[PDB]
């Protein structure tokens, strides 16, 4: 679509979410992924940590400053995973990669906006409940990431402000339900039209 797609990274498997996001950006869609620290990877944590430590070992022996760049932030880790699923050495792939914005936590532009979910990449449906998984935030923290604590504090601040918004939203909805009861005689004419056509059961 023409609008930006904002996806919540919590509870989403890394590769499965990256595959969906990669095809979306190749189709001209702007995608924003927030809470990349909440992304999950299947398999126990130690095993997934070994995979990144093996990644850390791959470096140019002659000059590591030129070699593979190992990004430790969860947002950049997810960004690199998507980059491995795009033709990033062509102009089409670079254009697609520039349509992806990745964030740790939820920054102020997107904290006030509704966030989508990809069921085909969710851990609850894609992974057996008895299997072990790893958190991208924990994996990032123990391999070099430096902002797990500050992101946690800011995410806790954001959650407190969101609860206040939800209580106002719930108070507004309660008032709307009371309003519907109050004006029922002057509404049943239009209520009946809605019911005949499947709206407002």
């Amino acid at each position: 679509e023409v609008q930006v797609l904002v996806l919540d990274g919590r509870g989403h498997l890394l590769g499965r979410l990256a595959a969906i996001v990669a095809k979306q950006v190749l189709l001209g869609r702007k995608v924003v992924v927030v809470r990349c620290e909440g992304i999950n990877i299947s398999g126990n944590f130690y095993r997934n940590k070994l995979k990144y430590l093996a990644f850390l070992r791959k470096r140019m022996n002659t000059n590591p400053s030129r070699g593979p760049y190992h990004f430790r932030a969860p947002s950049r880790i997810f960004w690199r995973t998507v980059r491995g699923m795009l033709p990033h050495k062509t102009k089409r792939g670079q254009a697609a990669l520039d349509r992806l914005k990745v964030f740790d936590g939820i920054p102020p532009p997107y904290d006030k906006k509704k966030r989508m979910v990809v069921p085909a990449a969710l851990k609850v449906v894609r992974l057996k409940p008895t299997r072990k998984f790893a958190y991208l935030g924990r994996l990032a923290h123990e391999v070099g990431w430096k902002y797990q604590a500050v992101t946690a504090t800011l995410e806790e601040k954001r959650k407190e402000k969101a609860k206040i918004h939800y209580r106002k939203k719930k108070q507004l909805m309660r008032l709307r339900k009371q309003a519907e009861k109050n004006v029922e005689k002057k509404i049943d004419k239009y209520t009946e039209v809605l019911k005949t056509h499947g709206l407002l059961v």
Binding site: T62, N63, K146, Y147, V150
Partner: protein
Amino acid sequence: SHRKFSAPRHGSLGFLPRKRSSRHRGKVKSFPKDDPSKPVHLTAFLGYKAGMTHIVREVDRPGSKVNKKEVVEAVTIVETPPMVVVGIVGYVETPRGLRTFKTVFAEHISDECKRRFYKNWHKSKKKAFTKYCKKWQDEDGKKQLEKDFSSMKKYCQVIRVIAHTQMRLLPLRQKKAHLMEIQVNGGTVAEKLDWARERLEQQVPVNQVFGQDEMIDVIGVTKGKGYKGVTSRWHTKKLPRKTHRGLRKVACIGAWHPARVAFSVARAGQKGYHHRTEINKKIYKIGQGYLIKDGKLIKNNASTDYDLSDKSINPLGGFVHYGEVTNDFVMLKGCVVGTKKRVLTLRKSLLV
């Protein structure tokens, strides 16, 4: 095949961009960890390497061969005239790091401080902070200044004060002052802003930052040596005299494969003028500096309770390639990076 006999590599790879420092002052790069339990204090200072001398003291180290024994010890004199606080910076912690939130500068910024803002003070018209100082007097500006302090008090985690040295007290040719952000530690953000606000435009002597016989870190830029070969830069073995095209070289700069010269091989380049931090430098004395109450009092600089001689720290004929030390000074144990009259940063120890 393997090298016949083992030998440790020459030089450290922790200092690899063996390049000229991008800065001349020497930045702190790491302030002591802040805990609000401690009283509000400053963590850094700027001094100038005046020179070196040696002292005689009595060692109180039990179980040592030098216990209750005289020793002599080389010391470095770092002239430390008082800082002047001319601003406050606030920082906010972000998932991308610390970013500068808001900066407030005091009224009445000294000329020596304002010289730092210009590349040609001679041709300049001294306009820096001329329109900013007016907001300290009008009512809209003061209200905006109070909002800036309030926003710092509620949004910033660490604050720092911009302090500058006093050139005209120094015997150097340079009149341009040195500015440094000095972190304020030990207290709530509100407490350290109130502390910093009341020190604006004021002087902070080196007494209020450092104390006697405490261990500090010295941050500065080493002496420049120009462009040097591998024998001086990396202290590799000199080749035998019979070598055809030169013996002050590294014979093998790599194997056939990986087919490139590696970053670990010793190669000619800049030596010196590198940024370095040395930790665990003990303060042997903080000198009072010259005073005039009725007459010129020079005693306290180099008089000891055993010596009792009216002599300054200045050697006979003056500190060579520096001048005469008149202000406060810190006497550090041992040697310190940098040439004479090289600006040094003194930082509180990060260790316990």
